[PDB]
Amino acid sequence: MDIILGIRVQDSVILASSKAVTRGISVLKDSDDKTRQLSPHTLMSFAGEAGDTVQFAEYIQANIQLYSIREDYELSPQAVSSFVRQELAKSIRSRRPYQVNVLIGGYDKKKNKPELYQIDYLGTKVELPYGAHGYSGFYTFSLLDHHYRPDMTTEEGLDLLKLCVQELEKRMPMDFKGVIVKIVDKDGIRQVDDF
Amino acid sequence: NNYDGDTVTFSPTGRLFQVEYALEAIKQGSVTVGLRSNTHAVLVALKRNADELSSYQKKIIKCDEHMGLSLAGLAPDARVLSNYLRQQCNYSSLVFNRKLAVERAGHLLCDKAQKNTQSYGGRPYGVGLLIIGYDKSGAHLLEFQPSGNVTELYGTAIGARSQGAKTYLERTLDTFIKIDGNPDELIKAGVEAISQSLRDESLTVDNLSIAIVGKDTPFTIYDGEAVAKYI
Amino acid sequence: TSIMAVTFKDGVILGADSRTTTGAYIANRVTDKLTRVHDKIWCCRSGSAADTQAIADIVQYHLELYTSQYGTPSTETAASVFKELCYENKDNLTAGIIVAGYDDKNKGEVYTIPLGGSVHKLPYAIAGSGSTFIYGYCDKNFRENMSKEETVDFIKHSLSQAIKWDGSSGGVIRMVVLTAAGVERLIFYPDEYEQL
Amino acid sequence: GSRRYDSRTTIFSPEGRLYQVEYALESISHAGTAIGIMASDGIVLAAERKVTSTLLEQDTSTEKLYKLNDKIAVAVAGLTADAEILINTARIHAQNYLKTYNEDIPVEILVRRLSDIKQGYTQHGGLRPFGVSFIYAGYDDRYGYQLYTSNPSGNYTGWKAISVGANTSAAQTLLQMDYKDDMKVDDAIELALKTLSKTTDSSALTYDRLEFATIRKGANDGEVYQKIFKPQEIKDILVKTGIT
Amino acid sequence: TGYDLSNSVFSPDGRNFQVEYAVKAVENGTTSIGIKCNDGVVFAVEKLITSKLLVPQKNVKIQVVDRHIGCVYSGLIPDGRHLVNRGREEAASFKKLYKTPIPIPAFADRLGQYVQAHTLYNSVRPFGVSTIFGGVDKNGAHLYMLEPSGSYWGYKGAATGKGRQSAKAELEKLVDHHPEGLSAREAVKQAAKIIYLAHEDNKEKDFELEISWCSLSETNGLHKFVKGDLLQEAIDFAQKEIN
Amino acid sequence: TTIVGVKFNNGVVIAADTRSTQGPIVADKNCAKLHRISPKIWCAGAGTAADTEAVTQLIGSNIELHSLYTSREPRVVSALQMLKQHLFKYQGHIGAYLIVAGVDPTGSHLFSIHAEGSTDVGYYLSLGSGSLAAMAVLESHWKQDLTKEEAIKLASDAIQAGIWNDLGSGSNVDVCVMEIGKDAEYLRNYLTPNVREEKQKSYKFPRGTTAVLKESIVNICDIQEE
Amino acid sequence: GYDRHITIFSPEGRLYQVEYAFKATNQTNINSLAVRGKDCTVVISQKKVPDKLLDPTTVSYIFCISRTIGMVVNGPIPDARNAALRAKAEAAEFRYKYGYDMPCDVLAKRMANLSQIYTQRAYMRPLGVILTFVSVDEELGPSIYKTDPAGYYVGYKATATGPKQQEITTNLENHFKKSKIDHINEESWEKVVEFAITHMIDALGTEFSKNDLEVGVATKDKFFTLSAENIEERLVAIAEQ
Amino acid sequence: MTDRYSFSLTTFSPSGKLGQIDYALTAVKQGVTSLGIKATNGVVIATEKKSSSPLAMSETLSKVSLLTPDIGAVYSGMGPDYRVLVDKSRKVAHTSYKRIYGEYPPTKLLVSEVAKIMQEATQSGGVRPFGVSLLIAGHDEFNGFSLYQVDPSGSYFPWKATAIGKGSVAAKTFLEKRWNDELELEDAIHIALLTLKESVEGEFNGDTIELAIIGDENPDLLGYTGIPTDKGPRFRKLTSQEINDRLEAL
Amino acid sequence: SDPSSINGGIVVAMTGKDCVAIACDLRLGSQSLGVSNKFEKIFHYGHVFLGITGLATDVTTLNEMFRYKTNLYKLKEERAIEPETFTQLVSSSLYERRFGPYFVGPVVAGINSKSGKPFIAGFDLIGCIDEAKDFIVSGTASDQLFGMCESLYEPNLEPEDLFETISQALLNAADRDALSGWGAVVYIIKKDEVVKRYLKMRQD
Ligand SMILES: [Mg+2]
Ligand SMILES: [Mg+2]
Ligand SMILES: [Mg+2]
Ligand SMILES: [Mg+2]
Ligand SMILES: [Mg+2]
């Protein structure tokens, strides 16, 4: 799919993902949720080739849920991101690689810290205060570089995110039909239903 | 005794007891007769029921338009061996546009049965077969034993009390071999042969199973009211 | 490369030039293209040096194992083993081999195995890039049941012309004589054959 | 054929017991006693080498205590060669986990893995089981200090104090008598050596017949240190605790 | 004891009892023979007529391998067929690689190594046949006989089955009385006589004679069955000698 | 790369330059191209450097095991046969071009091998990008019955021709002499005709020239006791 | 008592199946002898053709493994030929892989290793044969190396195998105790064969005709067997002095 | 065919004994005595060349074998089992170490690999244990000189000095009285020859005794010169003459 | 498209008197787009240091792989791996992927704990060892680094002088490469102390 953004503020991680699903000529859907809850305090957004994106995301979800049941324990965001990276690094030298880029937003309950990980389809992982995939970063990073502070509130993060989306809507040729925004914090994952 | 635990063990006198025990399963089986002339070949089989509510176990299996057999012993083994014959008949037709010779069909059955007598883990087949057919050298009748021994005959019988039918055919040899161009009389001779192996029970309409193949006759099986004519 | 084998009264003689090229560079000017696969069964190699060496080594192995079990192989048998390797692996080989051998029963025999992996029994055979220039000469000058001295002259004159016109051929003319008397190696230098 | 010579290692007895597991446990009961004691500030592993010689090179010798990683160690009771096969497999599992998740393997997960390998040999394959019982001493940031044991059946359990090998009945009673929950490592060191001293089949307990190890947070600040005791260090702790 | 319950087990003697028990199956079989003549070989076999219902001349026992080798055997007939099938695969692969038809000594070892392989493991049973075989190659005629152990040698004459002792004695007379050699046509006649003489050990039932031959002059080095007039001539010669 | 091999009276000598390159850039100025297959069997490699090293060590390893198995000193023909059959199998994808030389109980030997598995016999051979420059010298000065001293001289002169005239070759000459009934003598940097001249200036900086944001001690020691 | 049926240890640490394979070795009732000359290695073996129907030319226990290596076998012919075929295959493969002729001692070691495997692996039985390999090795010179069902092998100055090996061994021992050298100091192989036959006659106490013996000779670059007429010429020379 | 023995031939008996291992150890007990002594500057391993026949050339039978240039091995028990173990040990030193790290394995790790092979013959399907005990002597840079014993079970132990086989019990007592931590290599060789004489019945000389050392680097045995870091093998087999010289000072 | 220049970055290593230095930039990018300024390319396993340039997924993968292997090495050997031994392990590990290689340019640096000898080594993507006495360079500005090192380097520099030399070599090389920079780290390594210094540099 197209635009996926992430921003780590003081006490939460915010993931914004576009709603459009376009199959060549027509926009087939304008309410698509490009995300999966891997565990109660870990969310993964995704974008890439059709079919592979959801297939990969659900495969990861199943594996993390399996771990959660086996050990009666939630893996840290760092541990989950390392598992995901290895799967993609394994995938890139396969017969047919997963063409999927992901952002992993999680709240580490042990350290009481939000964490954002950016991983591309090659298995290139980086921990960031804010991140994106595709062309999204080209339009938004100059705004994030300017306004971002590590001590921002969730409300300030959402306001900076709105400015990013407005810039995308202005200068991007494609109509991505707005974004679904989700917040990951100590209380878990919730969706901002008005954005 | 100490040498009958598996098929891979000779006895001190050079016997293979597992093969001999497989042979014993045929003797427990219901009687079936085979005989031929120069134009036709006939199978006659006494079918066995479990009880009065049950059907009569089928004894005759078609392998091709020009070949088929009757069984005595373990029926599932006959299904395996007949399926193999069907495939071999079919391979010959598809690849070589050639109807499989009955003698060659016997050689193939011999070799398939032999492999089950020389290897560990397996078991011999527990069924005897009477193969009739009409090929480029006329009518044929074969007798298959799960020891691997296949024999071409004018007539024969296998199963329980088969000795009575076999002696009859040995007497009638000079008569029934000459029944050319008369299918009904050849079947009569077969029905009369199998009658020499009956005790207490007689040939009824759902008891009797007859098959025939010949010069201008595809392998066809007769059951039910189709054999009432011969009762 | 210019290679040939010629049957004659007392047996067979194999002949070859000694030039191996990488493009226009002569990588080896003293190559030995006459290869022994058995005591009195030799071969001439043309095409990929890697392929023809690999094939020859395998054949020599096969005939060595044959000899241990069944005694001396015929020249036909050797040719058959060559053919089996060349035909079955035709997609991955560039090899043109002439097989020559001496039996006491069959005497001198020559088999040629071109690119495809077919076999052709001939009174004599020519192969390699230089052979194209001597089809006319060889056809006009070959006779059956020549003497040893005549056959040496025939091969010497033939390969001389092949070398003269083919840039891929040159150096010395090597020869191996196969008769009842044994195996004789011959060599002829440029100053000898160029003046013919 | 071959069936004739097959012992059938993976069958139940009429009573519902696994013959080979039971006989492997009988083998382990003749091995040198190994003891593990868990305290609030660390774990102690103590083990007795089997009737040694004066010519044995002790300082380079290892038959009882093995390092699986920087956080987890094991005490062995049974066939040493069998144990080393499993130990190497455990070391690899720990590293596989570390590579996958970028975190040290939790103690129980490693223990479960080795225990599942043991279990497999009792249910399929027709091979004899491993004649080994382990005591696992380890630390992770979820449960802290942990003691486990596993045996040839593949069954594992957690402990505050435990023994394997010879005279476990006598050893376990002695541990059950003197163990307390608020105990410290230095106290546990003394209990372990006192227990071995009483249960040993030898005439006296000396340094050359012992292997000793501690897992302490007595590593400078927020980390864990493994200490495989040297022959001289075992000799000193024997004098300190008043056994020699 | 128990050494005879499993194949490939050495007894305290150094014997493989399972192979020796396979020999008992061979000794129980019908008589088969082989005669090496001047430029070829002759094979003959006793076929017991169990019943009148057996079609005469139909249940052929002697088998051809390639086009120049004949094979006959006594004992378990299916085992013999299995061995010949292998022989045919061996002969085919030899000719495929080396072009020339498999020489008889070469073929002899192919059968020998295969039969010997069935004395190496307890997962297989030894062959319950002794096989007399041979033919003409580039070095002339060869006759061989191969036992359940895998043991084989070259022979001037060979016999196996129930009437082997009788046959052997007859073969030994021919070797003594003909040091210069026997002709192919003579060997066919003699083969008929020897089977008829060896039939005294199987005198209860009557039998059918089956003969084949490979000869450089008579069959061009190809294996052929003796049929019609030549077979009847041999039967007459044989019947004359027993009376 | 320039590598040569030269037969002489009682043995064989191989030589090589010491420049390894990535495209037009000199990666290492003093590279070691003379590899040991066994104590008295040495070879020089051109082409893909990792392949020449890897194939040498593999065959060298198997040659050592073979020597131990047979209780015999390794032969050059064994190294040759194992190398060519390995290289042939990989159809030239292993880019190893070698000159293999050595002494063994059979005598002294000199072979070349192409990447695709073809081999060659000779009294003098040259391989690599400077092989034409080297072969020019060898063809001009080689004769039968060379002495040890003459062969070393000829071999190093052939390498020099490559050093000076081939851009792919440079720096120093390495030589290894394998004589019958003697230890093989490896002469590393036998010639050194390319020492860099003293620079016009010292570029040692004043301390504190570089701007630093943070300093910290890196813990290379293991977790400590107490 | 299944420790006697397969190759596993008995309570005494013995392998009975190996021991019984040694007993099968003498089933043919044939004695063989091998000696070394200056330039050659000679091996002689008794030849017994008990049946008149046999072709005597096909009755042999001496094998030409390679051009340089010969092998005599003590044991049943099926196992003998099994070992012969394998040895031939191993020798050919060696030459192909390593570019030189397989040495006699190396082949012996290889066949010994294969035999060792049969004593350790249960599904394979030992071969009931003793294999004596002979050659004139290009490095070691005249060579005799012998392999048995236990997987043991060693080089010999001279050796003997069969039911009456001890009588031949002691006879050979006594000769080398006199001469104080490791070989027969003789130039021609013909005289080394004459020595070999003479000392077998002395040891066994039996006379031999040309058909009672079988002789193999190894020289530099070839191993060959003697014909009955070559052996006859040998026997005539022995009788004439 | 196919190996249909996919089950263990070594199993636990009711008493907890692994019968086949015990019986393998019994076969080792019947074997000829071999010993090893560690000195401060070297290790010595020795055994008797029990010649099966005087016609046999016992020099062609090597009981003491080089595994790596710095590691040697000797045995007691079944010779053929030893010979194949030596072949596997030599190969595994390359495949599982030298082809990975570009250097020969340290003594303890090669011993570990040999031990693993012997352990597997004790558990794998359709095989018996090896009927040998090995004494492996070696040197490596970081561990110095070392001597290890490896048993049929796959268990291995490091020794200052020890003996295995026929007269091991008496030999070990003899070694206990003579060994100290200040022995030089020549002292250890002297003690080795003294100890070995007790278990030898017949001839006792350089032709009937096999003896090797792990000591100083032998640049004369390297086969080439020119590389300073390569200084030659530490394993050296003593000659018949070298042994006899030390038997006069006995 | 070219895997070795998608992410960018550089590593340089130098020897001095009883010391070695290894240094790297901190940039990770997606071609023209700068993604991270904290992507360190130098790792250590005990006292042996490994710098890795090239494709960033392989950099991460190989670090995890060598941590894996050196941890098992240490457990079995009962000692930390040495630079010379580790160099052979890197070479072995890279060549095992001969026909499907990791797209990397590794650099080893360290001091042998027993001899005290300074050691550096470099590799191509498939395992060929470059063991230079002076310096090793790697990455998208390797040409620039060769130019800097060849002129700036002199043998037997003291630790604090070597720091200035290697720092200036890296900084000025990186400023002539679009895909390198965004910060830099320098390790100064002595036999039993290692100092890590982050450098101040232009952020374009
Ligand atoms: Mg090709
Ligand atoms: Mg020209
Ligand atoms: Mg066995
Ligand atoms: Mg820049
Ligand atoms: Mg910029």
**CATH number of the domain that residue H36 is part of:** 3.60.20.10
Q: Do F223 and D227 touch (CB under 8 A)?
A: no
Q: In what order do the strands lie in the sheet with C95-102?
A: C34-38, C41-47, C95-102, C108-113, C120-122
Please return the burial class of F85, using the count of CB atoms within 10 Å of its CB with bins 0-12, 13-18 and 19+. Answer: middle
Q: Phi/psi at H102 (nearest 5 deg)?
A: 70, 20
Closest chain A C-alpha to D141 CA, distance in angstroms: 10
φ/ψ of residue H97, rounded to 5: -150, -65
* Helix G77-98 and helix C49-70, axial crossing angle in degrees, nearest 10: 160
Residue pair I28/I56 in contact by the 8 Å Cβ criterion: yes
Parent domain of B189 = 1-231
Dihedral sign of CA atoms H140, H141, H143, H146 in order = positive
The closest alpha carbon to G15, from G180, G135, G159, G125, belongs to: G125
* Residue pair F72/F54 in contact by the 8 Å Cβ criterion: no
* Ligand 1 centroid – CA F91 distance (Å): 6
Neighboring chain H residues of F186 at a CB cutoff of 8 Å = 224-227
F8 in Cβ contact with F178 (< 8 Å): no
User: Is residue D17 exposed (0-12), middle (13-18) or buried (19+ Cβ within 10 Å)?
Assistant: exposed
* CB < 8 Å to F122, chain C: 28, 30
Please list every residue in chain D whose beta carbon sits closer than 8 Å to the beta carbon of residue F225: 218-219, 225, 227
Gyration radius of chain I's alpha carbons: 16
- Distance from Cα G118 to the centre of ligand 3, integer Å: 4
Q: How far apart are CA B114 and CA B16, in angstroms?
A: 12
Which site among C66, C75, C80 would you substitute to test the E interface, given the most E Cβ atoms closer than 10 Å to its Cβ? C80
CATH number for I15: 3.60.20.10
Residues of D in contact with F224 (CB under 8 A): 219-220, 225
Domains held by chain E: number: 1
- Secondary structure string (H, E, C) spanning H197-245: HHHCCCCCCCCCEEEEEECCCCHHHCCEECCCCCCCCCEEECCHHHHHH
Measuring CA to CA, how many Å separate A178 from each of A18, A103, A118, A143, A165?
Answer: 6, 18, 21, 18, 8
Catalytic (active site) residue C35: no
Cβ distance G14 to H30 under 8 Å?
Answer: no
Helices and strands counted in chain I (H then E): 4, 12
How is I26-41 classified by DSSP, letter by letter? --EEETTEEEES----
For residues C4 and C98, the answer to whether their CB atoms sit within 8 Å is yes
Q: How far apart are CA D68 and CA D90, in angstroms?
A: 7
C66, closest residue in chain E (CA to CA): E98
CA atoms within 13 A on the CB side of B121: 7
CA H246 vs CA C187, E65, H47, H182: distances in Å: 62, 71, 16, 20
Q: Which one-letter DSSP state was computed for residue B153?
A: B
- Sheet architecture: strand order including G158-161: G158-161, G32-36, G41-46, G213-219, G222-225
CATH code of C1-196, in short, is: 3.60.20.10
- Tell me which architecture the domain covering F1-226 has in CATH: 4-Layer Sandwich (3.60)
Is residue E195 a contact partner of residue E61, using CB atoms and an 8 Å limit? no
Across the interface, do F119 and C53 touch by the CB < 8 Å criterion?
yes
Cα distance between residue C86 and residue H156, in whole Å: 55
- C-alpha–C-alpha distance, residues B162 and D79, integer Å: 66
Q: Going by DSSP bridges, is the β-strand pair C182-188/B67-73 parallel, antiparallel, or unpaired?
A: unpaired
What string of H, E and C letters represents the secondary structure of G213-232?
Answer: EEEEEEECCEEEECCHHHHH
**Is D1 an interface residue toward E (CB < 8 Å)?**
yes
B132, two tokens = 């009739």
Instruction: List CB-based neighbours of ion ligand 4 within 5 Å.
Output: I 181
Note whether E6 contacts D: Cβ–Cβ < 8 A: yes
What is the domain range of residue D104? 1-244
Pseudo-torsion of CA C144, C145, C149, C155, nearest 10°?
Answer: 30
* Count of domains forming chain B: 1
For residue G161, the surrounding DSSP H or E stretch is strand G158-161
Query: Residue C142 carries which side chain, given as an amino acid letter?
Result: F
β-bridge pairing E32-36 and E40-48? antiparallel
Pairing of strands F184-191, F173-179: antiparallel
Helix pair B102-114, B75-96: axis angle to 10 deg: 130
Task: Provide the 8-state DSSP code for B230.
Answer: G
Chains I and F touch (3+ CB pairs under 8 A): yes
- Chain-centroid distance of CA C177 in Å reads 11
Task: Inform me whether the C-beta atom of residue I67 falls under 8 Å from chain D C-beta atoms.
Answer: yes
Chain-centre distance of CA D132, in angstroms? Answer: 9
Instruction: Note whether D101 contacts A83, CB cutoff 8 Å.
Output: yes
Cβ atoms of E146 and E93 within 8 Å: the answer is no
Task: Quote the minimal CA–CA distance from I167 to chain F in Å.
Answer: 7
Q: Are E18 and E6 in contact, with CB atoms under 8 Å apart? A: yes
Residue G218's DSSP bridge partners are G41, G223
D218 by DSSP, 3-state: which? strand
Sequential DSSP letters for D150-210: E-TT--EEEESEEEESTTHHHHHHHHHHH--TT--HHHHHHHHHHHHHHH-SSSS--GGGE
CATH number at residue D155: 3.60.20.10
Dist CA C185 CA H190 (whole Å): 62
Phi, psi for F221 (deg, rounded to 5): -80, 160
Neighbours of H180 (CB within 10 A): 9
- Give the tokens for residue E13: 């003697």
Q: Are G238 and G72 in contact (CB under 8 A)?
A: no
B15 alpha carbon to ligand 5 midpoint, in Å? Answer: 92
Rounded Cα distance, F26 and I150, in Å: 11
Yes or no: say if B47 and B160 are a contact pair by the CB < 8 Å rule. no
Q: Which domain holds residue H96?
A: 1-250
Query: How do beta strands H224-225 and F184-191 pair?
Result: parallel
Q: Residue C185: count other Cβ atoms within 10 Å of its Cβ.
A: 10
Residue H1: count of CB within 10 angstroms of its CB = 13
Q: What are the tokens at F174?
A: 């390495």
| C-alpha to C-alpha distance for B223 and B215, rounded to whole angstroms | 22
User: Closest to H4 (Cβ–Cβ): which among E117, E120, E123?
Assistant: E123
Domain total in chain H: 1
CA of I27 to the centre of ligand 4 (A): 9
Helix axes C75-88, E77-98, angle to 10 degrees: 90
C60-71: b (≥16 Cβ within 10 Å) or e: bbbbbbbbbbbe
Residues of F serving a catalytic function are: 1
- Searching chain G, which residue's CA lies closest to the CA of residue H52? G154
Indicate which of F37, F66, F72 best probes the interface with G, i.e. most G CBs within 10 Å of its own CB: F72
Chain position carrying tokens 């003098």: F124
Overall size of chain H counted in residues: 250
Dig out the tokens for D145 from the structure.
């200090």
Instruction: Report the sign of the C-alpha dihedral through residues E126, E128, E129, E130, in that order.
Output: positive
Between CA I37 and CA G187 the distance in angstroms is: 87
Residue G208's nearest CA partner among G199, G217, G218, G197 is: G197
CA dihedral over A84, A90, A92, A98, signed as positive or negative: negative
Interface of I with F in 17-56 (CB under 8 A): 44, 46-47
Contact partners, residue D242, CB within 8 Å, separation at least 6? none
55-114 of B, contacting D, C-beta below 8 A: none
G-chain CB neighbours of D5 within 8 Å are: 2, 5-6, 122
CA distance I116 to I120: 13
Contact I143, I12 (CB under 8 A): no
Distances (CA, A) of G174 to E84, F119, F123, G177, I21: 53, 54, 53, 5, 77
Rounded Cα distance between F122 and D160, Å, is: 77
Cβ-contact D42, D157 below 8 angstroms: no
Separation CA H221–CA B28 (nearest Å): 82
Residues B124 and I97: their CA atoms lie apart, in Å, by 52
G1-241: which CATH architecture? Answer: 4-Layer Sandwich (3.60)
Question: CA-based angle C68:C72:C76, to the nearest 5?
Answer: 125
CB of G13 within 8 Å of a chain E CB? The answer is no
Q: Mind giving me the DSSP string for D36-104?
A: EEEETTEEEEEEEPPS--TTB-GGG--SSEEESSSSEEEEEEE-HHHHHHHHHHHHHHHHHHHHHHSSP
| Spatial distance between the Cα atoms of I96 and I85, rounded to a whole number of angstroms | 17
> What is the strand order of the sheet F119-121 is part of?
F34-38, F41-47, F96-104, F107-113, F119-121
Min Cα separation B8/chain D (Å): 7
For residue B162, CA distances in Å to B30, B37, B94, B158, D169 come to 9, 20, 38, 5, 74
Q: How far is it, in rounded angstroms, from Cα G202 to Cα G215? A: 17
Quote the tokens at residue H89. Answer: 């040990």
Q: Six-digit token pair at D184? A: 């410290």
State which residues form the domain around I67.
1-204
Q: Which residue of E has its CA nearest to G81?
A: E113
Task: Determine contact, residues E191/E226, Cβ cutoff 8 Å.
Answer: no
Q: Which residues of H touch G113 (CB under 8 A)?
A: 83-84, 87
* Domain chopping of chain A, boundaries: 1-195
By the 8 A CB rule, do A179 and A17 touch? Answer: yes
* C-beta of residue G18 within 8 angstroms of C-beta of residue G112: no
Distance from CA of H207 to the nearest CA of I (A): 39
Mutate to test the interface with G, among E110, E127, E151, E153 (most CBs of G within 10 A): E153
Reduce the DSSP state of residue E28 to 3 states and report it: helix
- Alpha-carbon distance of H196 to H187, in angstroms, equals 14
The CATH superfamily label for domain A1-195 reads Aminohydrolase, N-terminal nucleophile (Ntn) domain (3.60.20.10)
Catalytic choice (C1, C7, C112, C151)? C1
Asked if D101's CB is within 8 angstroms of A79's CB, the reply is yes
Distances (CA, A) of E11 to D77, E3, E20, E150, G24: 42, 5, 12, 18, 9
Contact E83, E131 (CB under 8 A): yes
Overall resolution, Å: 2.8
Residue (of E68, E66, E55) closest to E94 by Cα position? E66
Among candidates C60, C38, C77, which has minimal Cα distance to E95?
C77
Instruction: Give CA separation, A57 vs A77, E15, F25, in Å.
Output: 15, 68, 45
Q: Which residue, chain included where needed, has tokens 């048998």?
A: C77
Distance CA H136, CA H150 (A): 8
Catalytic residue among E30, E131, E160, E219: E30
Which tokens hold the place of E208?
């059918």
Q: Which residues contact A108 (CB under 8 A, 6 or more apart)?
A: A41, A76, A77, A78, A114, A115
Find, among F176, F197, F178, the residue nearest to F187 by Cα. Answer: F176
The Cα–Cα gap between D171 and D173 comes to: 5
Phi-psi region of I9 (alpha: psi -120 to 50; beta: other; left: phi over 0): left
Beta-carbon pairs below 8 A across chains F and H: 41
Q: Do A120 and I100 touch (CB under 8 A)?
A: no
One-letter amino acid at I67 equals R
**Which amino acid appears at position C26 of this protein?**
I
Q: What's the CA dihedral at F187, F189, F191, F193 to 10 degrees?
A: 180
Q: Which two tokens stand for residue E39?
A: 């430029």
Q: Which residues of chain C lie closer than 8 angstroms to G94, CB-CB?
A: none
Please answer whether residues D129 and D121 qualify as being in contact, where contact means their C-beta atoms are separated by less than 8 angstroms.
yes
Residue with tokens 């993931």: A15
Q: Work out the number of other CB atoms within 10 angstroms of the CB of residue F144.
A: 8
- SS3 string, chain F, reads CCEEEEEECCEEEEEEECCEEECCEEEECCCCCEEEEECCEEEEEEECHHHHHHHHHHHHHHHHHHHHHHCCCCCHHHHHHHHHHHHHHCCCCCCEEEEEEEEECCEEEEEEECCCCCEEECCEEEECCCHHHHHHHHHHHCCCCCCHHHHHHHHHHHHHHHHHHCCCCCCCEEEEEEECCCCEEEEEEEECCCCCCCCCCCCCCCCCCCCEEEEEEECCCCCCCC
Main-chain dihedrals φ then ψ at residue G152, nearest 5 degrees: -85, 150
Rg of chain G in Å (alpha carbons): 18
- Per-residue 3-state assignment (H helix, E strand, C coil) for E33-89: EEEECCCEEEEEEEEECCCCCECCCCCCCCEEECCCEEEEEEECHHHHHHHHHHHHH
Neighbours of G57 (CB within 10 A): 10
Q: How far is CA C142 from CA C126, C145, E73, I30, in A?
A: 12, 10, 55, 73
Residues of H in contact with G155 (CB under 8 A): 56-57, 59-61
User: What's CA A38's distance to the chain center, in Å?
Assistant: 12
Alpha carbon B213 to chain centroid distance?
14
CB contact under 8 A, A124 and I61: no
Residue I156: φ, ψ to 5°: 60, 40
Instruction: Using the CB atoms, write b or e for A77-105: b if 16+ within 10 Å.
Output: bbbbbbbbbbbbbebbeeeeebbbbbbbb
Place of tokens 């051109």: F46
Chains contacting F (3+ CB pairs below 8 angstroms): C, D, G, H, I
What backbone phi and psi angles, to 5 degrees, belong to C119? -120, 140
3-state secondary structure string, chain C? CCEEEEEECCEEEEEECCCEEECCEEEECCCCCEEEEECCEEEEEEECHHHHHHHHHHHHHHHHHHHHHHCCCCHHHHHHHHHHHHHHCHHHCCEEEEEEEECCCCCEEEEEECCCCCCEEECEEEECHHHHHHHHHHHHHCCCCCCHHHHHHHHHHHHHHHHHHCCCCCCCEEEEEEECCEEEEEEECHHHHCCC
CA distances from G124 to B59, E10, G200 (A): 45, 12, 36
Residue I183: strand, helix, or coil: coil
Burial class (CB in 10 A: 0-12, 13-18, 19+), G199: buried
Give the C-alpha separation, H184 to H171, whole Å: 20
